[PDB]
């Protein structure tokens with residue numbers, strides 16, 4: 338989509354992503370501490386951006402790195418690779434991974450940073466799975482290989498009031514009809530871990546080696562173990578990223594609220610009707626994640642909890 | 653423009669603007685403390701958004717309020733006015749102020765919140781001046797009536813290094829070619845007032861009663877009185893808003909770094925080549941503000957200082 342690749346044309350998003358130390362050091366450590374994965378191999382960097390994953394792979398001893406991006410950032414990547422004198426190892430190709438012509442039939446390794454808010458926002462894993470099905474050699478590997486999504490309950494009456502009740506009295510005037518636009522929009526924000534009132538519950542496990550495209554729309558029945566008697570005002574979502582297959586030095590990071598903040602923050606679903614929970618309670622709910630019918634890069638999250646159902650949107 | 657009015661269709665920008673207490677209380681105080689300006693008058697709210705200025709004017713005793721917005725937010729304004737039982741005083745009209753049909757020939761008062769980053773970003777004052785020339789009755793008033801733009805010198809080597817030098821060494825790789833995209837982009841951020849190294853210099857005075865459209869593209873020769881021997885790394889811009897004409901209770905707010913933060917923050921122009929200044933020095937420069945030839949809602953700021961010239965863009 339023209340709007341989608343246009344946004345990634347600007348250096349601003351690439352600066353934010355590169356300055357995310359948890360993200361950037363995790364990939365750096367994965368590659369530098371497992372050079373047996375890259376030594377003398379053919380590597381495909383899907384959505385290479387500025388191209389630093391391709392340069393990591395070269396440093397780790399890749400025979401050949403193919404960096405692919407549809408964004409205009411690829412022209413910056415070309416200059417960056419030339420500035421670093423790596424043009425004999427790294428080839429950059431402008432286009433969608435779905436339609437570009439590659440100068441090889443097969444690659445030994447696919448690496449990518451495809452993750453959106455709540456993991457699946459932007460639907461870029463579909464592109465990586467296209468690349469894997471078409472190009473990954475027999476016995477090849479895709480990294481990161483394992484991803485999880487988790488939910489956790491939140492009590493934060495003040496944050497709820499600031500976003501919702503706010504619209505009841507604005508300098509004496511009623512603006513209550515605005516609440517209808519607010520509730521269905523998922524909020525991307527850093528969550529104070531003091532406001533967590535449950536143990537986390539895993540709602541999705543993905544292995545990029547065995548997952549199909551169709552698996553990326555899913556339902557889960559979840560149980561949240563309530564740890565604090567309180568008013569439940571929201572459910573928050575986050576994701577964990579693992580580098581595992583054939584690793585001597587496994588790497589993990591979490592985007593959860595108990596972990597150092599990343600640029601992905603946490604995804605918060607505000608409850609239209611907050612409700613009381615008790616420590617020890619097993620809170621049962623159902624969550625379904627779909628691609629938005631209108632824009633398949635946008636997500637729909639359907640949440641059933643406390644005998645009420647709300648659908649939330651990520652952009 | 654479709655992109656422009658689309659952005660103002662979402663409640664998010666209206667929430668941010670309404671929660672800016674300095675902005676919102678300034679307009680509230682102006683209207684509530686000068687009701688003689690509104691009593692039994694016909695009022696035009698140009699770009700009414702959620703419509704709360706129209707409701708302020710009604711409370712202050714307006715005979716008739718016409719709220720105009722091209723954005724889809726106008727449908728929310730219609731519901732808000734009905735919820736407050738003000739539909740007999742306030743009429744909302746969907747369209748551009750340049751082309752809508754008004755049910756009156758003339759209005760006594762125009763009120764608007766048209767100000768962008770560095771005052772003139774988005775070029776919405778052109779629309780307010782259209783409305784004034786077409787609709788303002790003989791002896792009518794436009795608010796806010798007086799605006800200034802100021803510049804101030806900054807020393808912040810660390811912030812400069814974080815935005816510019818950062819690209820020289822990214823995990824051992826050279827990304828110096830990215831600096832070319834960064835320098836020309838004006839930064840909108842809250843400036844630490846401890847990093848100011850000059851007295852402010854006014855570069856523009858606008859009275860909305862007498863200013864022409866053509867006056868909104870301007871040049872100024874400025875002098876910054878340096879107060880701290882230091883490395884000058886940036887020039888910051890901000891603006892002041894006055895309610896004056898026929899006021900018994902005059903109202904002012906500043907978006908400057910010595911004042912409480914607003915959603916407009918400050919506009920920062922990073923210098924490609926920081927240079928040394930001395931306390932007592934009279935630093936002479938020239939600044940020109942133009943509409944972007946490609947998109948006239950975008951600004952071009954041409955800065956000459958220390959015998960070097962850089963053009964900066966606001967989106």
Ligand SMILES: Nc1ncnc2c1ncn2[C@@H]1O[C@H](CSCCNC(=O)NCc2ccccc2)[C@@H](O)[C@H]1O
Pocket residue numbers: 342345351354355360361362364365383384385386387388389390405406407408410432433434435449450451461464
């Ligand atoms: N179908 C597609 N075909 C081709 N390109 C596509 C497609 N879908 C999306 N894209 C691009 O994918 C990127 C995603 S954002 C990651 C940038 N890469 C990056 O920082 N690498 C360095 C790095 C450093 C440390 C840790 C991780 C990564 C954008 O540039 C999109 O334009």
Ligand SMILES: Nc1ncnc2c1ncn2[C@@H]1O[C@H](CSCCNC(=O)NCc2ccccc2)[C@@H](O)[C@H]1O
Pocket residue numbers: 657660666669670675676677679680698699700701702703704705720721722723725747748749750764765766776779
């Ligand atoms: N040519 C045009 N014709 C018609 N509408 C146009 C045109 N150019 C821009 N617009 C609209 O102008 C608004 C600017 S943003 C201020 C919203 N109003 C607001 O908060 N009022 C309440 C308030 C409270 C306290 C203090 C001040 C204000 C947007 O909604 C645009 O869609």
